[PDB]
Each structure stands twice: as C-alpha cells, then as structure tokens.
Amino acid sequence: MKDNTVPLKLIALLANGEFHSGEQLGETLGMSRAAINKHIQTLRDWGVDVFTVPGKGYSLPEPIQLLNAKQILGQLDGGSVAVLPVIDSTNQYLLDRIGELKSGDACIAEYQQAGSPFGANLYLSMFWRLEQPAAAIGLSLVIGIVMAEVLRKLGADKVRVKWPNDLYLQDRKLAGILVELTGAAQIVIGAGINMAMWITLQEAGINLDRNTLAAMLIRELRAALELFEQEGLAPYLSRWEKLDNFINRPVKLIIGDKEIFGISRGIDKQGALLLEQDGIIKPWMGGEISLR
C-alpha cells in the first residue's frame, strides 16, 4: 500500500491552525522547501484547505483533529484495529483480508480515496462472523442503536435512527451504515459519520474528540454484536423504540417502483417495519423510508 507518512506528518504540523512557513516546516521535517511545497500539493489533493500567503507561509482555516492510533488503542482492550487515516475504503481493506481476521477486528479512517474531504467524516468498518446469514436487517438495526446510543452519551442528544440503517439529527442524515455478506456467515460492517464541514456534528454545535468516539464505538459495537449473536434482536426492541426518528409519523415507503404511504409504527420482533395503512397494519421487510 502507498506510504503517506510525510503528508500526514505534515498535516499534523499544520493541524494547530496557525501559520507555518516552508523554512519552518522543512527543518522540522528535514528536507527542502521544494519538497514541502510538493507535499502541500498532496494535502490539497485530499480536499484539505491549506491557504498560502506570501510573506507568511501556510495554514489551515481551522485547527483540527487527527486520528491517532496510540490514543485509540490506548483506550481499547483487545483486538486488532487498523488506524489508517488514509485509505481506499475501510470495507475493502477488510474484505481483502477475510482470512486473517476475527470477529471484532477493525479499521478506522478519516478519508476514503474511493469515496468528501480529508477529516470531514469518520469511517469505521468491522468484521464479524456469525455462527449461522441469520441477522442482516436484524444486524443493521442493532448497529444504528449503538451508534446512536454512543453519540448520545458524548452529548449529541437528539440523535435518532432511521429504519433500517441511518442516523438522523434534526430530520437530516448524519450517518450511514452498510452491511456486506460473504459466501458461518462472514460480515463486514461499515459506517460513516458526518463530523465536520445532510447534516454534521459540527453543524449542530457538537464537537467530539474523534479518537474517543472511535474507541467507544468499537468497544460498544463489539459488545453489542456478541449480545446479538446469542439473543438476537429481543434485547434491543425497546431501545429501537426510544430512538426511532419516524415512529408514529406519516412516512412514504418506496419499495421498488412502488410508492406506499402510511404511518410508521416502529418495528416488529423481527426488525420489520410496521406500516399502518388505512387501519391496516403490516410488516415490511425492505424499502426506503422517507418523510412525507
């Protein structure tokens, strides 16, 4: 894989949001001001905002945070966790290593070359092997709960879930989850949170430490999945209820070509959407919910 140490090392230098000159950078990095100039371009290539001013140098319109493996692993117990601020995709990374992983192994990033600028979002993926493809929708629901739960704990109180895989805030999307199965069912979960700049944590006054958020999520996700793996959904049913962004609200459910109108009533014990239409209530196992 490509080596991005310098740019990173560099972005780290500039991170404080102040001004720094090539001379300045060069000596700390031990290299020509010509090189620096070269690495600045990269940053630029990653969506990073690095302003330049003649008799002044370079700086960032805003100080920032960077994943820091140390910190993260410092607050975790066991299991591999690959912290790669820069990567193609968190999911593929895992996908490609299906044979060397274990349930719980993870991968974290703040920029995906594959696909959104460096640091705007938090990416996380985790691997898990269920004893039996018995979950899925179940699974996705659990992931939203936890994540919503975790965010709340750090203070983003109005975070809610959107069946069956998004997180919402003020009726806008803040995060998305994805689940992928592999032909013992091998799964790779992935999620992306909108940290900073559809809505974002910053956008709404919340300013979390990303390393801690990463830490908790992994911890928490790992706990929840093993709970899932043996009790299924039962233990979340009530939790889902308190978080449902749309429960008892009129929604529109697009299922294929079909645009179906109704009132959300939550989910069933199987994680199915309960849609009530004209005094009738039925469970739907797929579709895209939207506000109507």
Curated annotation (Swiss-Prot):
Pfam families: BPL_C (PF02237), BPL_LplA_LipB (PF03099), HTH_11 (PF08279). The switch between the enzymatic activity and the repressor activity is regulated by cellular demand for biotin. The switch occurs by swapping of protein interaction partners by holoBirA. In conditions of high biotin demand, holoBirA associates with apoBCCP to transfer biotin. In conditions of low biotin demand, holoBirA dimerizes, binds DNA and represses transcription of the biotin operon. GO terms for molecular function: ATP binding; biotin binding; biotin--[biotin carboxyl-carrier protein] ligase activity; DNA binding; nucleic acid binding; protein homodimerization activity; transcription cis-regulatory region binding. One of its GO terms (cellular component) is transcription repressor complex. Residues 67-229 form the BPL/LPL catalytic domain. Residues 22-41 bind DNA. Keywords: ATP-binding, Biotin, DNA-binding, Ligase, Nucleotide-binding, Repressor, Transcription, Transcription regulation. SUPFAM superfamilies: C-terminal domain of transcriptional repressors (SSF50037), Class II aaRS and biotin synthetases (SSF55681), Winged helix' DNA-binding domain (SSF46785). Changing residue 61 to A: In strain: RDD012. GO terms for biological process: biotin biosynthetic process; biotin metabolic process; protein modification process; regulation of DNA-templated transcription. It comes from the Bacteria. Changing residue 58 to T: Does not affect repressor activity. Its EC number is 6.3.4.15. It catalyses: biotin + L-lysyl-[protein] + ATP = N(6)-biotinyl-L-lysyl-[protein] + AMP + diphosphate + H(+). Biotin binds at residues 89-91, 112, 173. Belongs to the biotin--protein ligase family. Acts both as a biotin--[acetyl-CoA-carboxylase] ligase and a biotin-operon repressor. In the presence of ATP, BirA activates biotin to form the BirA-biotinyl-5'-adenylate (BirA-bio-5'-AMP or holoBirA) complex. HoloBirA can either transfer the biotinyl moiety to the biotin carboxyl carrier protein (BCCP) subunit of acetyl-CoA carboxylase, or bind to the biotin operator site and inhibit transcription of the operon. Monomer in solution. Interacts with BCCP. Homodimerizes to bind DNA. Interaction with the corepressor bio-5'-AMP increases dimerization. Contains an N-terminal helix-turn-helix DNA-binding domain, connected via a linker to the central catalytic domain and the C-terminal domain, which plays roles in dimerization, catalytic function and DNA binding. The N-terminal domain is required for both ligase and repressor activities. It may orient the active site and thereby play an important role in enzymatic activity. This is Bifunctional ligase/repressor BirA. It comes from Escherichia coli (strain K12). The gene is birA.
